[PDB]
């Protein structure tokens, strides 16, 4: 009866004024921190887009989302999709973000189940995954932290999205005696 379900959806408000941001890259750790950036300030929601760009091996990606009731009155209607992040990510096919699995999407990808003694999930605020040494095809996937239904003092929150764009990296098959095969990972 209980089962894993798939879902669709990109936005709930007008767009094309996305306000892109790059991720904060601390030398191998790429971070999208939404703690102060989604608090309700302007009347009406403002979509904010963090952009992670990966063209090198073993990049850790950390995404921080504030919790429901983490601070009083500011996150009473926060939502995060997908719920099983980072095991489930959002991918765009028909301009709708449909739920797909990250281990099918990049082959050989490993997800630690505990980020820092707490569960690797948005229930604990922060998700975190490390990309493998070789990715063979370019891949884009998405996460959403929607505070745009929270309203305090007649001001609505923000819809933050994370776009992880992985370029192909890892080099050619030959002249890589370590990742080639016949004895290897």
């Amino acid at each position: 009866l209980s089962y894993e379900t798939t879902e669709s959806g990109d936005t709930a408000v007008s767009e094309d004024s996305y306000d892109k941001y790059a991720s904060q890259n601390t030398n191998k750790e790429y971070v999208c921190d939404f703690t102060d950036q989604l608090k309700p300030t302007e009347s009406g929601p403002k979509v904010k887009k963090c952009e992670v760009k990966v063209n090198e091996p073993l990049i850790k990606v950390k995404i921080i989302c504030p919790l429901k009731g983490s601070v009083e009155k500011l996150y009473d209607n926060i939502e995060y999709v997908p719920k099983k992040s980072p095991y489930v990510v959002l991918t765009k096919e028909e301009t709708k973000l449909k739920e797909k699995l990250l281990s099918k999407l990049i082959y050989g990808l490993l997800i630690s189940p505990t980020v820092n003694e707490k569960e690797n999930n948005f229930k604990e605020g922060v998700i975190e995954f490390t990309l493998p040494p070789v990715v063979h095809k370019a891949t884009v996937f998405y996460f959403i932290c929607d505070n745009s239904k929270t309203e305090d003092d007649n001001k609505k929150g923000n819809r933050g999205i994370v776009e992880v764009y992985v370029e192909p990296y890892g080099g050619s098959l030959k002249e890589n005696l370590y990742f080639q095969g016949w004895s290897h990972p």
């Epitope: 790059a22 921190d33 300030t41 904010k48």
Partner: antibody
């Protein structure tokens, strides 16, 4: 000996255009986010525009976007602001300013060094 | 856009005494605040970043404190150089980076 020399200010009638430049010296120019901040006579500081070390994330003030255009030349150590279709509100002294590091979603976006500004007067 | 209200409007204080300035924010900025000094006719000088981390080349009499909504810049023993206008700036919820409207400290004689 960090130096930021602004140039290009002056008097323009409303609707006209102007191009401010900022020649910098004394630091590695390609690893700094460049910014323009204006100050009306007697009034406070107002940020107008910014460009990251990666020339993809450019940000404008809400009142000036669609009129202003920021640009960067890393080889000449120069920063540019084209101001077109100027209204009367834009009369101010314009300061060239630096932020250490690239422009991210969060963290440490304060103005490390400033220039001496140039006056832009919009009046008919 | 969250507004930064500075208090007081003008502050008259004798040299050698202590001056505390208050920056108040509409929404929490959570330690993403900077203080700048502007002597008249000059460019602003960065004083304190991070709301308690003194910038390099800044006198020790300047000190920053505060969280979320309320911040204070304190000059403990005031000198002649420090008579200027002082601005607070948040960099947490952006665009835009918004400034306060300034606090003029004047030499009481």
């Amino acid at each position: 000996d960090v130096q930021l020399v602004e140039s290009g200010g002056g008097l323009v009638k409303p609707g006209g255009s102007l191009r401010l430049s900022c020649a910098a010296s004394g630091f590695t120019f390609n690893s700094y986010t460049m910014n323009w901040v204006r100050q009306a006579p007697g009034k406070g500081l107002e940020w107008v525009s910014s460009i990251s070390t990666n020339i993809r994330y450019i940000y404008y003030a809400d009142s000036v976007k669609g009129r202003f255009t920021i640009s960067r030349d890393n080889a000449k150590n120069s920063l540019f602001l084209q101001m077109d279709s100027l209204r009367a509100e834009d009369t101010a002294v314009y300061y060239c300013a630096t932020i250490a590091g690239p422009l991210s979603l969060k963290g440490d976006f304060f103005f490390d060094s400033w220039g001496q500004g140039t006056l832009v007067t919009v009046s008919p | 856009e969250i507004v930064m209200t500075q208090s007081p409007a003008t502050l008259s204080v004798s040299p050698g005494e202590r001056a505390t300035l208050s920056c108040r924010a509409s929404q929490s900025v959570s330690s993403s605040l900077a203080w700048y000094q502007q002597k008249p006719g000059q460019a602003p000088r960065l004083l304190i970043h991070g709301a308690s981390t003194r910038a390099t080349g800044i006198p020790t009499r300047f000190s920053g404190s505060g969280s979320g909504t309320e911040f204070t810049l304190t000059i403990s023993s005031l000198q002649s150089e420090d008579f200027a206008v002082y601005y607070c700036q948040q960099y947490a919820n952006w665009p835009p980076w918004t400034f306060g409207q300034g606090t003029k400290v004047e030499s009481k004689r």
